[PDB]
RNA sequence: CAGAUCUUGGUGGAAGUAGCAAAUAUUCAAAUGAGAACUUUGAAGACUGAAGUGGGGAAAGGUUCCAUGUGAACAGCAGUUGGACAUGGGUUAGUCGAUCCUAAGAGAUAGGGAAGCUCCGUAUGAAAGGCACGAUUUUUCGUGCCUAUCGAAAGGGAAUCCGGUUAAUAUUCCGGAACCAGAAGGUGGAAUCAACACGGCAACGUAAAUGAAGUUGGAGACGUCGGCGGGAGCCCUGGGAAGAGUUCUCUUUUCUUUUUAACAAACCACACCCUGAAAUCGGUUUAUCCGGAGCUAGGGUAUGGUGUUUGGAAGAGUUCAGCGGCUGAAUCCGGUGCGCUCUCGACGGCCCUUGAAAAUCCAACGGAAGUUGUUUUCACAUCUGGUCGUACUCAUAACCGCAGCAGGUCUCCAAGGUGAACAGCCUCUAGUUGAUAGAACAAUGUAGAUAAGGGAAGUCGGCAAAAUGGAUCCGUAACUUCGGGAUAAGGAUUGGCUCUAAGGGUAUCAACUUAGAACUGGUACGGACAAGGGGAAUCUGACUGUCUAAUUAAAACAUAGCAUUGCGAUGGCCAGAAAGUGGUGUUGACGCAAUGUGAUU
RNA sequence: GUGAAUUUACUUAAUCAAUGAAGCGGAAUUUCUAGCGUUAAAGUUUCGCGAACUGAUCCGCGUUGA
């Protein structure tokens, strides 16, 4: 059995994505499907974030807060290693400027 | 060893002239060879675009501004030495 | 490109570590 | 559609005012399906035991509309 | 009897293809902090500018007046890496990539993206592998003599800024293209300037060099500077001509 | 095509209504000089050109 | 008016003449009817043969759709038939599009030009608008803080599926089952007098789990090629069950039917974490990458359907057996892969090419506010969703070519055999059997075939034709830019059938792929189809590529390379009537502009 | 156009460059690291995130630079 587009859009494009199904009436048919979702990228390293699904942007609005975030500082914005580097670098440079302040105050 | 002289420029066949294929051979070997990363020491630096050399090493991921076909050029090295000399005498 | 088939690899394994032992 | 694995859950949803009708479906494998039409979902309970089937059917509220296969 | 190809290059299909450009490469606007001290920025990413032989560098600075981050698009110099700190100002150090006034740098310093005049954010030595040399200073007149990549000597104000180092991407012209196709792709992101038909291969209505039974000019191809727009073809106002 | 504007369907609807034969009782009137519709159109032969 | 290749209209001889010859093809019976080569039904014979003569859409058309009716006219024969003529009927959306967004680009406003029509200009030489605090402040307001619009029915984007239904409409109606967004309060639960939850060493998890201004991040959001792996449908296949074809004979067989949607729930291992410290270095892909910046190994975390299990849902759909709408059954259990289409995953290659924006959406940092009361991105119920498009054709008859014209016109789906193949040839589903016919085989012709002996003697010229041709094995010159030339040239081999020999997975299963060995046949053999003739050299352009649409495809143009010239911005070059005008220029000499030669040597 | 002795200077007319027209002219007197920097506060003086004054000098005011 051959199939047709269910819409008046010909021209398979990045939005005219179709799938083959067998209906309970023994018919081969297209189901028009959307583009795959995307796991949010990390803000510093750019890698995908761990613990968050791959949804479309508007589709994220239907999740609860914990499903879109990770229970950590910058959770849902930065990866674990990126956050750890932020923490260590912040503390070390604050220690450096304290030492330099001690040296230059005298 | 499959080709005796053309090497990487064997993909060009018999065209464009021997000398032009020869000059391309030097540059293409430089352009595609893997380079040691100055930041992580791994041999992980490769060219993304002319002048941009990115390291694929895990944890380093450094991106470099450099020469078109080689990571470092003679002109840059020579002037870096002079600039270092100038700053030291200042 | 050695070990043209599974049997050839087997015989190489059998002779290896047997000449050693 | 929703599947309910608990009989008392089926009664509780039937007690809820959103329940509109109920269907009893007798299958060829002697397994009954108790289906409950609500505002949002068709709640289905698969009862494979005969004796639990009719005590549940008489357990269903009299005001609810129960319908044969 | 027809408007020639040189005359038609006033725009339209001869405009620059500017969809994929990654911003205009400019120095920081000359502010109080960069006039009197230095401001430090972080190199976020080295990026490829379509139609440009040299990479660009996205550098994030802090606004000295507001809680916000200003990201500046620089011409990357060789040795610039992501995560590097770049200091711009009078009191900046003499390190590769730092932006300093030309008057504060010693004679013979190799600089790039040099300002013609104080505050125009970079004019000279911007192409890949090119640089400007600080020939000398004239403190009394507040000027700096510099050597341009064409070999010309130019005077710029001592307050004009320049990036220390050579523009990255050098040696880009050494490699032969080998291909009309590769010349097609290079110019496909710059403008409609390729391929080029010779004037002698045209007809008299189309070009001064067109016409005749044999492909020749018929007149001297060295032309004056006072000539008309339809006449400025060949070698315009050539002092010398021929290969030495 | 199937995709039409509302303006097009209005012009097409009026064109359809004007592409009809004349009522028969018109032909029986006093002083009548109208017999057949002189503005009739066919879909292959003449195009509406809108 | 006899003239002007006079004007307009009319009409002749030619003339019942040229002609109605591309796309294999029709035939019999019956029906209807005044009338049948052409209409309809049945039977037969065929073709398109999945890159269709099939099923759909976009542009364009506009009612051609559908039923009924039919004197003409039109369908270059015919006509009872028709896209023709007449009469009615027909397109139903919160979910499919348009609308929304921005793209290249258009285009107001501020301004400036112009005698003016109007031109330029798009955050510019614009006073181009907001938001928050307060016993109410001299009951005459104070204190703070920071860009139009149009333009995409192929781009971006909220959310619908199955079965059924009409003469003609369906993701729109009907039945059943969902989903999205917005809004209000309500119910149940969760946090809180230790104000804004806990657990996990960690990756992070949990049904919840306040977060203003401000800032920042992500998604939206992205090339092309190559193999590899996963899924789905298809193809293929072993049994079972229902009918059906075949049955001189043979065939536990030949064919058909064996179906399961959105949605809902549960389930499911390259990156990351933990312990541990590795050289006799190991791990590992088809492809050589990885590791003291922590390998291997061990144990975890995350990602999670087009997967599995169930709900939907068998009551549906399909197939069969009866009965006069109804009643009985069946709708089962598995395999397989260098297969096909789509898709996903992890990778590799390539670039002097690095391959959109914006609307929308989410997150973080920050810490304003804050016994009842506060919060609550948690589970539930509750209500709503406008406007326009929607029939039909999408083409050997619905579009454009004056037409029902052998022309042209974007794209989706894509069965079996032969074979490397989406080749050609043949077939299944579907579609069609349409193109004036009949009878005759004169010359000439168009389109195909063949020809003894010779073999280019023909001709301006081997023009046309022939010959060669797949695959396997052997063999392969000059010359060369060392890459090529090269399928050089030259030889041999090819069927059927019975056999073994190896090549994989867990005793046993699955799968075409090569090597032989005989035996056998009008010395046959890529048996139809398909499918290079070759060699020695000259002139010339290096090459791939481009042009005179409709007489010139070339040696012409382009090209890479080489070279020259102008220009360091108050500049070169180009444009504008002007301008507070534009292009190069989101540019800066490795640049742009102007030319001439035309790879290499 | 304005001055100072053809020679020098000045800028308000015009020209050019930059921007969000932020620190111009006088006087008084932030560099080992890809982190964060906002929604003042201490000090002083009146009367709690109510004020004031400084924190964060004054003056000129020509948006700066050629």
UniProtKB/Swiss-Prot annotation, chain B:
One Pfam family of this chain? Ribosomal_L37ae
Q: Which InterPro entries match?
A: Ribosomal_eL37/eL43, Ribosomal_eL43, Ribosomal_protein_eL43, Ribosomal_zn-bd
Highest taxon listed in the record's lineage? Eukaryota
Q: Which Gene3D superfamilies match?
A: 2.20.25.30
Give the subcellular location.
Cytoplasm
Q: Where are the zinc fingers (C4-type)?
A: 37-60
- Main localization category: cytoplasm
In alphabetical order, the GO MF annotations are:
structural constituent of ribosome; zinc ion binding
Could you tell me which SUPFAM superfamilies the record lists for this protein?
Zn-binding ribosomal proteins (SSF57829)
Q: Name one GO cellular component term.
A: cytosol
Protein's GO biological process: cytoplasmic translation
The record's keywords, sorted A to Z, are: Cytoplasm, Metal-binding, Ribonucleoprotein, Ribosomal protein, Zinc, Zinc-finger
Its assembly, as annotated, is: Component of the large ribosomal subunit (LSU). Mature yeast ribosomes consist of a small (40S) and a large (60S) subunit. The 40S small subunit contains 1 molecule of ribosomal RNA (18S rRNA) and at least 33 different proteins. The large 60S subunit contains 3 rRNA molecules (25S, 5.8S and 5S rRNA) and at least 46 different proteins.
Function in brief: Component of the ribosome, a large ribonucleoprotein complex responsible for the synthesis of proteins in the cell. The small ribosomal subunit (SSU) binds messenger RNAs (mRNAs) and translates the encoded message by selecting cognate aminoacyl-transfer RNA (tRNA) molecules. The large subunit (LSU) contains the ribosomal catalytic site termed the peptidyl transferase center (PTC), which catalyzes the formation of peptide bonds, thereby polymerizing the amino acids delivered by tRNAs into a polypeptide chain.
What family is this protein classified in?
Belongs to the eukaryotic ribosomal protein eL43 family.
Q: Which gene encodes it?
A: rpl4301
Swiss-Prot record, chain D:
Q: Which UniProt keywords apply?
A: Cytoplasm, Ribonucleoprotein, Ribosomal protein
The record's subcellular locations are: Cytoplasm
Q: Does the record bear Hydrolase in its keywords? A: no
| Cytoplasm keyword on record | yes
What InterPro entries does UniProt report for this protein, alphabetically? Ribosomal_eL38 (IPR002675), Ribosomal_eL38_sf (IPR038464)
GO cellular component, as recorded:
cytosol; cytosolic large ribosomal subunit; preribosome
Q: Which GO terms describe its molecular function?
A: structural constituent of ribosome
Q: Name one GO biological process term.
A: protein-RNA complex assembly
The record ties this protein, via PANTHER family, to: 60S RIBOSOMAL PROTEIN L38, LARGE RIBOSOMAL SUBUNIT PROTEIN EL38
| UniProt record similarity statement | Belongs to the eukaryotic ribosomal protein eL38 family.
Quaternary form? Component of the large ribosomal subunit (LSU). Mature yeast ribosomes consist of a small (40S) and a large (60S) subunit. The 40S small subunit contains 1 molecule of ribosomal RNA (18S rRNA) and at least 33 different proteins. The large 60S subunit contains 3 rRNA molecules (25S, 5.8S and 5S rRNA) and at least 46 different proteins.
Protein known as: Large ribosomal subunit protein eL38A
Q: Which organism is it from?
A: Schizosaccharomyces pombe (strain 972 / ATCC 24843) (Fission yeast)
What gene is behind this protein? rpl3801
UniProtKB/Swiss-Prot annotation, chain E:
User: Which compartment or compartments is the protein found in?
Assistant: Cytoplasm
Spell out the SUPFAM superfamilies in the cross-references.
Nucleic acid-binding proteins, Translation proteins SH3-like domain
User: One GO molecular function term?
Assistant: RNA binding
The record's annotation in Gene3D superfamilies points to:
2.30.30.30, Nucleic acid-binding proteins (2.40.50.140), Ribosomal protein L2, domain 3 (4.10.950.10)
Keyword Ribonucleoprotein (UniProt): yes
Q: What is its main location?
A: cytoplasm
GO terms classed as biological process = cytoplasmic translation
> Per UniProt, which keywords does this protein have?
Cytoplasm, Ribonucleoprotein, Ribosomal protein, RNA-binding, rRNA-binding
In which family does this protein belong, per the annotation?
Belongs to the universal ribosomal protein uL2 family.
Q: How does it assemble?
A: Component of the large ribosomal subunit (LSU). Mature yeast ribosomes consist of a small (40S) and a large (60S) subunit. The 40S small subunit contains 1 molecule of ribosomal RNA (18S rRNA) and at least 33 different proteins. The large 60S subunit contains 3 rRNA molecules (25S, 5.8S and 5S rRNA) and at least 46 different proteins.
Q: What other comment is given for this protein?
A: There are 3 genes for uL2 in S.pombe.
Q: What is this protein called?
A: Large ribosomal subunit protein uL2A
Question: In which organism is this protein found?
Answer: Schizosaccharomyces pombe (strain 972 / ATCC 24843)
Q: Which gene encodes it?
A: rpl801
From Swiss-Prot, chain F:
Q: List where in the cell it is found.
A: Cytoplasm
- Is Ribonucleoprotein among the key words of this record? yes
GO-annotated biological processes = cytoplasmic translation
| Composition bias type Basic residues, residue spans | 1-14
Q: What is its main location?
A: cytoplasm
Tell me the InterPro entries matching this sequence. Ribosomal_eL39, Ribosomal_eL39_CS, Ribosomal_eL39_dom_sf
Keyword Ribonucleoprotein in record: yes
Q: Which UniProt keywords apply?
A: Cytoplasm, Ribonucleoprotein, Ribosomal protein
* Listed GO CC annotations: cytosolic large ribosomal subunit; preribosome
Disordered: annotated segments: 1-20
What the entry lists under Pfam families is as follows:
Ribosomal_L39
- Report a single Gene Ontology molecular function: structural constituent of ribosome
* Physiological role: Component of the ribosome, a large ribonucleoprotein complex responsible for the synthesis of proteins in the cell. The small ribosomal subunit (SSU) binds messenger RNAs (mRNAs) and translates the encoded message by selecting cognate aminoacyl-transfer RNA (tRNA) molecules. The large subunit (LSU) contains the ribosomal catalytic site termed the peptidyl transferase center (PTC), which catalyzes the formation of peptide bonds, thereby polymerizing the amino acids delivered by tRNAs into a polypeptide chain.
Q: Subunit comment for this entry?
A: Component of the large ribosomal subunit (LSU). Mature yeast ribosomes consist of a small (40S) and a large (60S) subunit. The 40S small subunit contains 1 molecule of ribosomal RNA (18S rRNA) and at least 33 different proteins. The large 60S subunit contains 3 rRNA molecules (25S, 5.8S and 5S rRNA) and at least 46 different proteins. eL39 interacts with yih1.
User: What does the sequence similarity comment in the record state about its family?
Assistant: Belongs to the eukaryotic ribosomal protein eL39 family.
PANTHER family to which the protein is assigned, alphabetical: LARGE RIBOSOMAL SUBUNIT PROTEIN EL39, RIBOSOMAL PROTEIN L39E
